[PDB]
Design a protein around this ligand. Structure first.
Ligand code: ADP
Ligand code: ADP
Ligand code: ADP
Lengths: 103, 103, 103
């Protein structure tokens, strides 16, 4: 399993929720943020989306996010992929890929 | 050392602080969030807790969180475990497990 | 590439932005938080800064943060370093170190 961190323009949150639903993804945690980078130190409002996903889905999610969110204007955002050693569902104590099931 | 990310119902924050104190954990950083998943895309309020811990404590913290927070109702939340390559205390410049000491 | 998580007193955010600019770092995402630890469970306001950086810069950024932010008073904060498997720029679809370029 992998962690995705998706940092976007807030207006693009609906489209990120749809991309993850369209790949069977079970859930997501959304944080408000301020970001700085190339867009013109100017801070701008951002949404930071965290989702845990099965390893075979990551490549298609990254392609989907570029194809559907790109505006060709500076500031569209970033996606990173990082490793997960253990995942647990609090309600059941289930570990591994069972912890992300649709139920 | 490992990073835990604990995503919970906000009413359960007091019990997460007590579980970490009961395992000698030095600290925690708390973020407000909105989450989507199985509970009935409906966004619901969540707390996202980050804590850095010694590797031998992770198994007992995961057991404690399942045993004390489970309600057997959908939406109790998730815990993940991920790797840490370096940890530094800003005040002293100390690295490694010394950076998390109680002082 | 590596992820840094920098958890600080809010008054120190200007100095963290300057340290990252002084090492050529392209950007940063800023989250408001509450933290608990050694400082006197008392919750205190914090800023949580996430930045993605090239591996050869991490050692000098950690030294800079200790030298410029240390007050020798408990509560100055923490820096962690964690691994990144993939980085993508949404606007272009570019991966790897190209995804963090100044443009
Ligand atoms: N090195 C970085 N680390 C973390 N977040 C970054 C980094 N660079 C950019 N970001 C985030 O992505 C947002 C957009 O980045 P920006 O450089 O303006 O756009 P682009 O990626 O289109 O060149 C920023 O406002 C910030 O939230
Ligand atoms: N795949 C996921 N990635 C990240 N956060 C998730 C994921 N699935 C669920 N969550 C988080 O956990 C919360 C509860 O999940 P939910 O599916 O409703 O409960 P359960 O785990 O009891 O089936 C969500 O509101 C969200 O914050
Ligand atoms: N184990 C920990 N995991 C995550 N964040 C931590 C941890 N310990 C401390 N912190 C964060 O760093 C802040 C300052 O830590 P504190 O223990 O008061 O200072 P010091 O590091 O100077 O002893 C906390 O308020 C919290 O945000």
């Amino acid at each position: 399993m992998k962690k995705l961190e998706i940092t976007i323009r807030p207006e693009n949150l609906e489209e990120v929720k749809q991309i993850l639903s369209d790949r069977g993804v079970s859930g997501m945690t959304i944080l408000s943020a301020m970001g700085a980078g190339n867009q013109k130190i100017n801070l701008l409002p951002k949404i930071h989306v965290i989702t845990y996903v099965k390893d075979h889905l990551v490549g298609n999610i990254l392609i989907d996010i570029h194809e559907r969110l790109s505006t060709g204007e500076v500031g569209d955002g970033k996606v990173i992929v990082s490793p997960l050693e253990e995942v647990m569902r609090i309600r059941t104590g289930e570990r591994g890929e069972n912890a992300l099931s649709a139920w």
